[PDB]
Swiss-Prot record:
Section covered of the full-length record: 4 to 209 of 774
Record domain Lon N-terminal: where: 6-197
Broad class of the protein's primary localization: cytoplasm
Protein name as it appears in the record: Lon protease 1
Protein family: Belongs to the peptidase S16 family.
Cellular compartments annotated: Cytoplasm
GO cellular component, one term: cytoplasm
Induction comment from the UniProt entry of this chain: By heat shock.
Subunit composition and interactions: Homohexamer. Organized in a ring with a central cavity. Exists as a mixture of small oligomeric species in solution.
Length: 204
């Protein structure tokens, strides 16, 4: 099944699956044009993740070929010229023709099909069990960690140890190591925790 001339929206550091519903804040000129172009027609767009998160104008080489045929549900034009859109993934599809225009990129795609056994039911039971084991195990580990860190009397040592358990990029951990001053170190770690807390709430 073929869909011609679908406006392309390259995602950075984010992947949308069919049936997922989320808000997106769009700013790249060529991305807001793609949105605006879709709203002038059937409200459909093609979301495809960029491979290199640092590129601002990705060519076909820099986007994955398979992505998600998507529906714009609500679109809001912000003060600054940015757009806040609510989208819903519908179907997976693959780029089959790349129409790079001046204002935005457009793409021809072919919808991909799948598609409930009694095997499938077992596998789901297994998926849920392992997922639950993994949730249970994180909860258990992090608790033991909180209790260990609780009994630490030295500020410098508490800042280091708490930093070593947070999901921080290495360069951030290195920053902590490179912060000799204990008060400065504690502050940075507190701040890191806040970011990690805010990021969690963002992804939800």
């Amino acid at each position: 099944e073929l869909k011609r001339s679908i406006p392309l929206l390259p995602l950075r550091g984010l992947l949308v699956y069919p049936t997922m519903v989320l808000h997106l804040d769009v700013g790249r000129d060529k991305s807001v044009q793609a949105l605006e172009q879709a709203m002038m027609h059937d409200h459909m767009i093609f979301l495809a993740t960029q491979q290199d998160i640092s590129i601002d104008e990705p060519g076909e080489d820099e986007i994955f070929t398979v992505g998600t045929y998507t529906k714009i549900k609500q679109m809001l034009k912000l003060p600054n010229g940015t757009i806040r859109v609510l989208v819903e993934g519908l179907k997976r599809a693959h780029i089959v023709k790349y129409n790079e225009h001046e204002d935005y990129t457009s793409v021809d795609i072919q919808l991909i099909h799948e598609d409930k056994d009694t095997e499938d039911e077992a596998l789901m039971r297994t998926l849920l069990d392992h997922f639950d084991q993994y949730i249970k195990i994180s909860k258990k580990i992090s608790a033991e960690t909180y209790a260990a860190v609780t009994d630490i009397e030295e500020p410098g040592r508490m800042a280091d140890i708490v930093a070593s358990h947070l999901p921080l990029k290495l360069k951030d951990k290195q920053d902590i190591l490179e912060t000799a001053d204990v008060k400065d170190r504690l502050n940075k770690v507190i701040d890191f925790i806040n970011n990690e807390k805010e990021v969690l709430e963002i992804e939800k």
